[PDB]
Structure formats: structure tokens, C-alpha cells
Amino acid sequence: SMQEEDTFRELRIFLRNVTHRLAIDKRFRVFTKPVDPDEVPDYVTVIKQPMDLSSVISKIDLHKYLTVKDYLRDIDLICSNALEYNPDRDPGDRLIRHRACALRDTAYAIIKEELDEDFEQLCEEIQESR
Ligand SMILES: Nc1cccc(-c2nnc(-c3ccccc3)[nH]2)c1
Ligand SMILES: [Cl-]
Ligand SMILES: [Cl-]
């Protein structure tokens, strides 16, 4: 219905705003673009499901997220990919992991403070009906 389309549009607007706040945070610059395969050529073969904030924005616009839970699964994937690609004790890896965890924690904290659970529940119940 019209009212359901309005609901998903509000969800997209909400998710774009949250993603934008993540993307302008200097800590998260490394997660704003997909990995360049001329800098780490083996990235695309190790990491089977690359995810980054540019891709998340593209998926919002393609109406791929019908719930906040769907969105957070991709934020979680940005984080978990980073933990797996950079597992070592050296400072470069530890810095990336810390930023990845912070990205994840920041998204969840924004959602906890700013998302009405009844709005999420509505999105879920529409998504289950289609
Ligand atoms: N999940 C995700 C999304 C975008 C980038 C990355 C990433 N993981 N590790 C790197 C990296 C590794 C060595 C030097 C600089 C960045 N970048 C990981
Ligand atoms: Cl840096
Ligand atoms: Cl190590």
C-alpha cells in the first residue's frame, strides 16, 4: 500500500542519515570505499562478501533494506570482514580492528538512541507479509 511505501521510504531516509554520520567520521575513512584491488589485489579472493559504507548507501537506494536488522547485518559484515582480514597483533592491524569495532558500536548506539522500536517492528511486520 501507499502507507507501507511511505514507511519504507522513512526507513531509507533514516538509514541514509545514519550512514552519512558514519561516513564523515574520520576514524571510518578506510571503510568508506571498497578496497582498491591495485593496493590489495588479493582482497577480492579472501573476502567473499566485501562490504563498505559506499556499498551500503547503494543498497539503501536500491531498496535492499526493508528492516533495520537487514542494515545492521551489513554493518556487522564491515566489522567482521575487517577483523578477519587484519587479525595480527601489529599496530596497523590493531588500529583497523579498533576502528571496525568502533564503527559497529557507533551504528548500534545511534540506532539504540534514535530508532523507535515500534517503527522497526512495523517494518518487520510489513516485510513478513510480502
Ligand atoms: N570491511 C571493510 C570495508 C572496507 C575496508 C576494509 C579493510 N580491511 N583492511 C583494510 C586495510 C588493510 C591494510 C591497510 C589498509 C587497510 N581495509 C574492510
Ligand atoms: Cl590514519
Ligand atoms: Cl600476531
Swiss-Prot record:
Disulfide bonds: none
Induction entry: Up-regulated in breast, uterus, colon, ovary, and stomach tumors. Induced in breast cancer cells overexpressing NCOA3 or treated with estrogen. Down-regulated in 5-fluorouracil-resistant derivatives of the colon cancer cell line HCT 116.
Residue ranges occupied by any Bromo domain in the UniProt entry: 3-114
Tissue-specificity statement: Highly expressed in estrogen receptor positive breast tumors and in osteosarcoma tumors.
Recorded coiled-coil stretches: 108-130
Places the protein is found: Nucleus
Stated role: May be a transcriptional coactivator of the nuclear receptor ESR1 required to induce the expression of a subset of estradiol target genes, such as CCND1, MYC and E2F1. May play a role in the recruitment or occupancy of CREBBP at some ESR1 target gene promoters. May be required for histone hyperacetylation. Involved in the estrogen-induced cell proliferation and cell cycle progression of breast cancer cells.
Subunit structure: Interacts with ESR1 and NCOA3 and these interactions are enhanced by estradiol. Interacts with acetylated lysine residues on histone H1.4, H2A, H2B and H3 (in vitro).
UniProt family annotation: Belongs to the AAA ATPase family.
Protein's UniProt name: ATPase family AAA domain-containing protein 2
Residues of the full protein shown: 981 to 1108 of 1390
